[PDB]
Design a protein around this ligand. Structure first.
Ligand SMILES: Nc1ncnc2c1ncn2[C@@H]1O[C@H](COP(=O)(O)OP(=O)(O)O)[C@@H](O)[C@H]1O
Ligand SMILES: Nc1ncnc2c1ncn2[C@@H]1O[C@H](COP(=O)(O)OP(=O)(O)O)[C@@H](O)[C@H]1O
Ligand code: BEF
Ligand SMILES: [Mg+2]
Ligand SMILES: [Mg+2]
Ligand SMILES: [Zn+2]
Lengths: 97, 175, 633, 96, 48, 204
């Protein structure tokens, strides 16, 4: 919920997940996500509905999107002898979906 | 003369297009709206509504569009502590009375909780007990005793724990 | 321009005042008190009186409904009648103002429900004070002096707020010259100024809907009503919901709406800044003294705190003493000695540490509840706003002369405890930050709860590794208790029957299956002695509001002093505590000597004794020994 | 009400840098990329004023996009109070 | 659709949907008010 | 997060959230029952390690909860085929689908009716049974705690007695009986054994 300084009013902008309600969301540099971005990704992939509770707006936007993501193995190269867990910093609940 | 005048109240609402149904890199278009009398205090921010009103024009060559409110078709929204019926019609009450006397209603509610989910029978029974909740009590000295039952699920992934939680929120009054 | 309706309302209210002689007696008492105060010089109570609207409704329904619905035409007649009554009574050679208490029906609202339909109606709003303007004087009469003639000229000013009915607008022009052109010198000190303050009341957080923006109303206070509230208080302001200004109807979006203030009530609530004062009737005082004459009065009171909590008798005695508190010493040179008892509870999960804290929160005159990580060192002590650079009083400052109940003390950050050091010991909060050098005063007693470091208190290791707290911090706490959840069949059984008896408790008038409804219990700040149901089933248990009355009476009336027999007992106990090694749960400092003195003083307070005897010192020593050694006789 | 006219294939193509001044009051063809849209605002086309002494809406007046006709002298009343635009009587056009 | 609002819809009842993102504070307006001349002391009652 | 955990501690048991930020001091109300699902400390919990190690939560958090359901994804071929067939039938197989299932809306309204109309109380003869079972359970856990050097990762405290009482009252409220029944107590103890004390038994 951000306010444009020139026009000075609140706008409810959903994430890329919300914008791609009935489409795809291409997430490049998937390993290099912020904590908030990771939490939002997890919420969208699990419940298909991002919820917002800021500035008095208490609602759950809908985001039913197929995610096509590109991520880089740890160290800029995939180590074959390790499993998928050690190769990518994403935790198992993120990958399982 | 203020002590003799009579007043009515006005409340300004601002409507925005549904955030998903917007051009990709464009700020959603919002439109200033006005209501009065008994239509005030009928919505809260974040609610998804349908509006019947008069499209109008306000001068700040260009003009500012806005809508007078004639009726607010408030859709079904999040059920909060305040947002609840709390009032049961008679026929509903007798139907619940009939249901309470069924001998297998414990099994029915066990079967009714996550029927698509296979197994986890005692888990479903505990979920039913959680949904009912215990008794909330207040001792004379001010001591308050817990009147809620909190349940933990702990197991390997893929055991439908997330799906069971989703069902619990879908069935419970507030969650 | 005399009016018939005004005169008739005036005489009707005079009849009402004559009917209910209590208001007449109160006016007489105010007058004689002011006269006596003037007599001693060869405080001044304000010319205000509280009216019970219920009695007015009983006496005259029409006039009552007139006050509630259209106060503009009804309050001024009542004030004139009251002024006439006061003048008539004051035969001994500034009008009186009127105030209201009682039920307001559908006009008792919150700032969220002050719809325009309630305008021009006597409303009673309840909420939290967010902003308070500075108490500024208002010019109402300006006395001037003409140097040539030598005659003092005056003018009287007014504005829409200071009167209920709309008066004809006369512009306020300051008289600079005489009618004949002579220069005038304004005479400050003869002109009259009235204090004026505006406060904003916001919807109460306890009752406000969660996740939505709050709604606020502005209150205009005047004269004696100024500075009766502190920001963050919970108040019940009653007054006319007047609307002011042309409201843009006149060519340059609504009307300026505010609640003109008639009466403000600081509402006591759980964990707020306002204390709770209980009225002490002579019946109550007699009962308190009679119960004080009992022998095991300390035991009776201590067992009365948490009947629903089995055991922890010594913790209950310590909490009772903490509520009573010790005397404060301010030496002539300027030094300060702490007179409060701090209590720390370290124990295994489910040993009732929190429930005791919650009881203290609900029963202390002024208590504030905080948790560890949620409330930082900014939450405690005080903080600078930087908005210019005003001080925001934190938890410990708000709880002055009160109790701070900290939960999850173990979890709270080390920086937070570094902050809390000085407050717990020196009872001051110093800012000296960002060019703001002030020393806030926070004389509060702290009670806290912490889990042992290893989740449970494993007695195999030393107390230091389980406690996991700095030694200085443990030195701050007067009494440190370690409670262990140990398995014992007799104790487990007894706990089981006690808890079961508590669960099968019926309210006086509730059905067997009826759900019990909670209430906010917003007590107003200003039946028998004992309790019918004792969950532990003979030592009598006193009723908890009576316990609050007893604590208030003891704290106010009695100030004990140390005596030689005690001095000797405390000295010997401190010496043999310090010089003997028994692997104490806490180290011994001079703070333990201060603790012995403070507990002795608190026990003397409990007995309502002006002096401390040997028995009080013995009790204090035994309690401290149970705290440290973990053992008693 | 009115038919507008579309003109395409202007032989002169000018980028935003070379407009200068000689191209003023002349038809010009430019290329670019859209950055921001200000939305739709109904612009006055057939404006209908009224006078306080009149008590009725004056005859509709066309308003071209140069500058609206702020009438100060009433045609009928010669009164200095004709500043009022009644909404539904005026015809509006989209402006973005 | 909120983007489809057109000048042809001015002063016409329009059906549309969206999301409420802000509700301003209640402002009291005038529906019947009594006025007075400062000179004539002539009471009146305007209705809006 | 830890700052959330410290607040969740008080919310679950004292049913309230205490706030003392700079300038605002209040005790909000959170009278809710929390249902929590979490993976163990590892991706898969190995009983090969000390079974107290696969329990990541501390003793106090588990003391808040009224039960800990340790669910294991066993490797039965017949049970796995059962789950697969169930899923296929549900997922547009249309092999499913009267009088044995209550609709979500109807069940929710029944929940509201049960919570708002009645709130039972324990029968006096139920108290003796509850006390006996509580003492026996604590003594069995003491036997285990003497047997095992490590303290039980899942503790049994007075909160467990509160949990059993609350479950019994929940069942009675479900049956809309103003007085809790002995059968209710037996069912509650059966759930308690099936939910807790098997996680405790699974651990040393
Ligand atoms: N016992 C089960 N019965 C039916 N479906 C199940 C069962 N276990 C898992 N599933 C299916 O697997 C998913 C649920 O597992 P999930 O919620 O991801 O578990 P976790 O809580 O460990 O993340 C859903 O697609 C659900 O249909
Ligand atoms: N000695 C006791 N007597 C009565 N109730 C007790 C006792 N010990 C624990 N309880 C109950 O157990 C629960 C846990 O108490 P609580 O204060 O939350 O524990 P903790 O010490 O972990 O903060 C409460 O419902 C309380 O009533
Ligand atoms: F488990 Be407790 F709140 F120390
Ligand atoms: Mg999951
Ligand atoms: Mg605790
Ligand atoms: Zn004209």
């Amino acid at each position: 919920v951000r306010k444009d300084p020139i026009t000075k009013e609140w706008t409810l902008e959903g994430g890329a997940l919300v914008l791609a309600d009935k489409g795809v969301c291409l997430i490049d540099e998937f390993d290099k996500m912020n904590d908030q971005d990771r939490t939002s990704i997890h919420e969208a992939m699990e419940q298909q509905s991002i919820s917002i509770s800021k500035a008095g707006i208490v609602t759950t936007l809908q985001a039913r999107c197929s995610i096509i993501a590109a991520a880089n193995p740890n160290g800029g190269r995939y180590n074959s002898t390790l499993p998928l867990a050690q190769n990518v910093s994403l935790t198992e609940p993120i990958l399982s979906r | 003369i203020h002590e003799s005048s009579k007043f009515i109240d006005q409340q300004f609402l601002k409507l925005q297009e549904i955030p998903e149904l917007v051009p990709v890199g464009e700020m959603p278009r919002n439109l200033t709206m006005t209501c009065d009398r008994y239509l005030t205090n009928k919505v809260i921010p974040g609610t998804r509504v349908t509006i019947v009103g008069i499209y109008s024009i306000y001068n700040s060559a260009i003009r500012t569009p806005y809508i007078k409110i004639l009726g607010i078709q408030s859709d079904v929204e999040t059920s909060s502590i305040w947002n609840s019926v709390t009032m049961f019609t008679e026929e509903e009450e007798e139907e619940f009375l009939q249901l309470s006397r069924n001998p297998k209603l414990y099994e029915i509610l066990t079967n009714s909780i996550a029927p698509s989910i296979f197994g986890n029978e005692d888990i479903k029974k505990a979920i039913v007990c959680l949904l009912m909740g215990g008794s909330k009590k207040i001792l004379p000295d001010g001591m308050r005793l817990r009147g809620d039952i909190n349940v933990l699920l702990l197991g390997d992934p893929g055991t439908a724990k997330s799906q069971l939680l989703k069902f619990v929120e879908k069935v419970s009054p507030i969650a | 321009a005399p009016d018939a309706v005004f005169g008739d309302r005036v005489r009707r209210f005079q009849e009402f005042l004559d009917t209910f002689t209590s208001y007449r007696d109160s006016v007489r008492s105010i007058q004689v008190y002011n006269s006596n105060n003037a007599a001693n010089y060869n405080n001044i109570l304000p010319h205000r009186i509280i009216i019970s609207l219920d009695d007015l409704r009983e006496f005259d329904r029409s006039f009552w409904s007139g006050i509630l619905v259209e106060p503009a035409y009804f309050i001024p007649p009542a004030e004139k009648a009251l002024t006439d009554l006061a003048d008539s009574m004051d035969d001994v050679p500034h009008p009186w103002k009127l105030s209201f208490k009682g039920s307001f029906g559908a006009h008792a609202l919150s700032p969220r429900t002050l719809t325009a339909q309630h305008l021009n109606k006597l409303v009673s709003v309840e909420g939290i004070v967010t902003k308070t303007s500075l108490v500024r004087p208002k010019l109402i009469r300006s006395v001037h002096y003409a140097a040539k003639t030598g005659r003092f000229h005056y003018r009287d000013y007014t504005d829409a707020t200071t009167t209920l009915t709309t008066r004809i607008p006369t512009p306020a022009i300051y008289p600079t010259e005489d009618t004949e052109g002579n220069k005038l010198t304004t005479e400050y000190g003869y002109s009259t100024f009235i204090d004026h303050q505006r406060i904003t009341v916001q919807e109460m957080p306890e009752m406000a809907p969660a996740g939505q923006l709050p709604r606020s109303i502005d209150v205009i206070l005047d004269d004696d009503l100024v500075d009766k509230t502190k920001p963050g208080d919970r108040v019940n302001v009653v007054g006319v919901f007047k609307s002011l200004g042309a409201g843009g109807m006149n060519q340059s979006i609504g009307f300026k709406t505010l609640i003109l203030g008639n009466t403000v009530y600081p509402l006591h609530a759980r964990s707020t800044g306002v204390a709770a004062r209980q009225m002490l009737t002579d019946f109550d005082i007699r009962n308190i003294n009679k119960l004080s004459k009992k022998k095991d009065i300390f035991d009776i009171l201590s067992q009365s705190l948490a009947p629903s909590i089995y055991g922890h008798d010594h913790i209950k005695k310590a909490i009772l003493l903490m509520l009573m508190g010790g005397v404060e010493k301010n030496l002539e040179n300027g030094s300060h000695l702490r007179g409060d008892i701090n209590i720390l509870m370290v124990g295994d999960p489910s040993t009732a540490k929190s429930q005791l804290l919650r009881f203290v929160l609900n029963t202390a005159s002024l208590a504030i509840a905080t948790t560890g990580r949620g409330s930082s060192g900014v939450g405690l002590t005080a903080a600078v706003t930087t908005d210019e650079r005003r001080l925001e009083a934190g938890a410990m400052v708000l709880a002055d002369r009160g109790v701070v109940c900290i939960d999850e003390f173990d979890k709270m950050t080390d920086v937070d405890r570094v902050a809390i050091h000085e407050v717990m010991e020196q009872q001051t909060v110093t800012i000296a930050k960002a060019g703001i050098h002030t020393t806030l005063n926070a004389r509060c007693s702290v009670i806290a709860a912490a889990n042992p470091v290893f989740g449970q208190y494993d007695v195999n290791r030393d107390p230091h590794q389980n406690i996991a707290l700095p030694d200085s911090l443990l030195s701050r706490f007067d009494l440190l208790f370690v409670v262990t959840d140990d398995i014992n069949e007799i104790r487990d059984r007894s706990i089981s029957e006690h808890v079961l008896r508590t669960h099968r408790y019926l309210p006086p008038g509730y059905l067997e299956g009826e759900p019990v409804r909670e209430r906010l219990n917003l007590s107003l700040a200003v039946d028998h002695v004992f309790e019918k149901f004792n969950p532990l089933l003979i030592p009598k248990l006193v009723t908890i509001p009576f316990l609050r009355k007893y604590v208030q009476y003891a704290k106010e009336r009695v100030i004990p002093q140390l005596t030689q027999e005690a001095i000797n007992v405390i000295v010997k106990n401190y010496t043999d505590l310090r010089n003997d090694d028994n692997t104490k749960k806490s180290p011994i400092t001079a703070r333990t000597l201060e603790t012995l003195i403070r507990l002795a003083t608190a026990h003397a307070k409990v007995r309502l004794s002006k002096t401390v005897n040997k028995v009080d010192a013995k009790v204090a020593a035994n309690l401290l020994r149970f705290a440290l050694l973990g053992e008693d006789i | 009400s009115e038919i507008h006219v579309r003109i395409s294939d202007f032989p002169t193509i000018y980028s935003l840098r070379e407009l200068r001044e000689s191209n003023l009051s002349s038809l010009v063809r430019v290329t670019g990329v859209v950055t921001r849209r200000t939305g739709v605002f109904p612009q006055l086309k057939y404006v209908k004023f009224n006078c306080l002494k009149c008590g009725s809406i004056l005859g509709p007046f066309f308003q071209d996009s140069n500058e609206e006709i702020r009438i100060s002298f009433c045609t009928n009343c010669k009164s200095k109070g004709p500043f009022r635009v009644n909404g539904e009587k005026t015809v509006y056009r989209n402006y973005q | 659709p909120l983007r489809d609002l057109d000048s042809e819809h001015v002063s016409k009842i329009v059906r549309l949907s969206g999301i409420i993102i802000s509700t301003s504070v209640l402002s009291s307006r005038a529906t019947y008010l009594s006025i007075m001349c400062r000179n004539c002391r002539h009471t009146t009652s305007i209705t809006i | 997060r830890d700052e959330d955990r410290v607040a969740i501690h008080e919310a679950m048991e004292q049913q309230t959230i205490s706030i003392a930020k700079a300038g605002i001091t209040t005790v909000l109300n959170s009278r809710t029952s929390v249902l929590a699902a979490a993976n163990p400390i590892y991706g898969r919990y190995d009983d090969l390690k000390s079974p107290g190690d696969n329990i990541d939560f501390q003793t106090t958090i588990l003391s808040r909860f009224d039960m800990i359901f340790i669910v294991k994804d066993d490797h039965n071929e017949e049970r796995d085929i059962s789950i697969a067939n169930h899923v296929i039938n549900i997922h547009t197989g249309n092999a499913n689908a009267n009088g044995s299932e209550i609709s979500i809306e109807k069940m929710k309204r029944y929940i509201t009716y049960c919570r708002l109309k009645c709130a039972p109380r324990l029968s006096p003869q139920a108290a003796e049974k509850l006390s006996s079972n509580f003492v026996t359970i604590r003594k069995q856990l003491l036997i285990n705690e003497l047997e095992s050097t490590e303290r039980s990762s899942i503790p049994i405290t007075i909160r467990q007695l509160e949990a059993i009482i609350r479950i019994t009252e929940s069942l009675a409220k479900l049956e809309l009986s103003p007085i809790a029944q002995e059968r209710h107590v037996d069912e509650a103890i059966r759930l308690f054994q099936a939910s807790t004390m098997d996680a405790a038994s699974q651990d040393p």
